[PDB]
Symmetry: C5
């Protein structure tokens, strides 16, 4: 349990061996979640990259937030993908929150505190809770099989996860700053293991 | 009967089966009206879609607010249409207010609190009081004959209707969300029925 | 003799029969004038139109403010024309003031409270006192001979006229909504006759 | 000497006969100077024009501030020219200050209170003190030989000249019109002669 | 040892002979550093130029901050270059800070107080302490071999340097004007030699 407040993980160049493994108190399967995080990369007009990679022993893409060049954000749950298209890239750090709810299939995707349209994905599914949660690489197997062509080059931080859907008022707090207590991954009480070329530095964003 | 304040209807996937039917205490046929609503969709550069479908047994397009692909807003009263061309799509929630007065034929169309020029439509006509008012689908018959290629995919809310023409000052109060009470459809006391895949969630816009 | 404060004339369709004639209490030969007004039309990228038409029995274009397609504002006194070119159309209400002085020939043209450069027109000329002053149409004879393809379609209001050139401070006050006292035509004590399809409605601009 | 505060000279049409001669109480040659002024013209895309023409018996362009069509501002000392190119023309009144110091050759050119990069011209030169200073026309001889295709059509005023280089703090005050006391030409104590069609009117700029 | 507060160096013309050489008693090789400065030039869309050139006998580009036309900022440590692409030039003074740490190889580049992505250069290297630190020219040997085609034309000032990586809050303090004390180069106690056409003038930036 380490407090990572105001610090981010830095992956300064492309590799297939640099990653952070985040440990969640494994539990019953999830019927809903929210994941929020900050990241900052120049890779967006060049190639695609994984932002957050959650795999189970039986599904490598159990939850995957990904940037796909010439498209925009890619969001996948239990192997099924949906797109949130982005016509202009930002040259600045980005905050995202994304959520999924089994009962409705609704996915929300929030970029710098502003919502995309609601979309539909994997209504009725359950997300497994024996997970391998990885920052900086895209998993093709449980805890492994990374591709350098999907590695994250740049900074990522403030990764928090909850097992329910945050309301728009709660998102606004996470984006602007205020008190909250994530119950799956908490940045202020983070259990993690680093591997390869990854550094811990003061965050570049407010 | 339900205060829908801060909530919206969500239509997360294309279909011809998902809709909301709004119930008005309607008695007197209409010689004037104002409709205002907020909606959020990414469909605008892909296809046309219906925003507000008001149908009677004599005229399926008695009041129709529609987005026409590569044209802009389409406004229909008693089967006759007028266009408000839009050169550039805004991809963000939009507030619209539209009004018609039979005496002059004057139509107004307001987008995010800004007026379009006044136009003329159906001077002398009377709009039927026995109506089916639908969100999410376009009616080709009283309460039905929907076409999936005209469904709204996204969120709609703050739907309000009056049986007279709001003044520019009153429109501004609606847009900034000051106190009002509509006399045909009131979002703060709405009676409605839901069909198919539609959800009620906290509104995405402020 | 009517206070038109906060109201505008609406000309919702193309025609050669809808117009307003304004009556000055006057008849003194003009050695100078200023004309101010607000108007709102969506015609500007499609065709030309008359904005303010002042005719005497000797000269149909005695004072003429006109929009000419692909050029911009055309301003004529005593049948002689000067242009104030406009590269990009504003699709929003516009406020204009224009003035002329016989002694110097100096013309000013102010758009949304901002001055165009001073130009020269008809130095030494006298503008006739007995006039037909028309809104909505362009006159080719005293009080008539209108051309439908040059009709104003949209709203016009706040029309005022003085028999001297307003200073830049005075125009700034008129634009910003301060106090002023027109001595030829006064929108707050307006004597007029309407013909054809013209309506009086709350103004759309603040 | 008259106080011309709040007034500007107006040259309403092209000519080669309209100009204003400004009288400086000059004696000792100049080893530095600053000239500031406001001007407003719409000529900038169709031809060049003189802004401030200072001539000596031995040199017609002893100091010349000129607008070169398709280039931007042209600044000359003792017949040697430097350019401050302008990619996009502003169609609004402009305030300029420009300075030159013989000890360094450094030229400054400020446009609407913002400094261009410093440049180099005529280091060690001395500027003649028996001068003909004209507005409205470009001198090819001491007090004459004007070219109509180089005449200023528009307004000019707030013309002030010191025999030293103003500091950045002082320019900011001259742009803000805080207090200042020029020692060569003082718009508040101006001695001048007019010729041809030039008018004095209240300034268009605030 | 001069207090340069509120002054800048001015290089008014392109040459290969105008430069400033900054002196300080550095003894310890550098395992980290930060440099900050203001500069202002109009060269950016015409050609490349050197902003801060730090050479050792071993390496002419030991630390080099450089502008490359049609590309952006170039940052070099020990002859190894990284780019920070800039597609739209800022035609105004700019403040930059740049830092490197040997332990991680992480480089930071901040423009007008906002950070670029973190990149990687020369992990494990050491920057030599016996240096030639030049403004105004780019070094191809220890203290010389200047190329006029890489000369800086414009102003530079507020040059400071430290032997450690400034944190984000420390950069804020510098950019926003708070008191600070640098430990390698200090604008308030600057020792230097100058050759050629270089002037000291009041700074053009705040
Ligand atoms: Ca995978
Ligand atoms: Ca993969
Ligand atoms: Ca229909
Ligand atoms: Ca249909
Ligand atoms: Ca005509
Ligand atoms: Ca006519
Ligand atoms: Ca000359
Ligand atoms: Ca000449
Ligand atoms: Ca070199
Ligand atoms: Ca070189
Ligand atoms: Zn944040």
């Amino acid at each position: 349990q380490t407090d990572m407040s105001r610090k981010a993980f830095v992956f300064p160049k492309e590799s297939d061996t640099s990653y952070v493994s985040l440990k969640a108190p494994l539990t019953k399967p999830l019927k809903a979640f929210t994941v929020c995080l900050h990241f900052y990369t120049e890779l967006s007009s060049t190639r695609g990259y994984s932002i957050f990679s959650y795999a189970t022993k039986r599904q490598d893409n159990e939850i995957l937030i990904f940037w796909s060049k010439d498209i925009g954000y890619s969001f996948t749950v239990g192997g099924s993908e949906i797109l949130f298209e982005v016509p202009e890239v930002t040259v600045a750090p980005v905050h995202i929150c994304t959520s999924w709810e089994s009962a409705s299939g609704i996915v929300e995707f929030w970029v710098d505190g502003k919502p995309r349209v609601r979309k539909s994905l994997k209504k009725g599914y359950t997300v497994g809770a024996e997970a391998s949660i990885i920052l900086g690489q895209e998993q093709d197997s449980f805890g492994g099989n990374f591709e350098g062509s999907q590695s994250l080059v740049g900074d990522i931080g403030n990764v928090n996860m909850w097992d329910f859907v945050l309301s728009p008022d709660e998102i606004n707090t996470i984006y602007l700053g205020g008190p909250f207590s994530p119950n799956v991954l908490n940045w202020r009480a983070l259990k993690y293991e680093v591997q390869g070329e990854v550094f811990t530095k003061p965050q570049l964003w407010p």
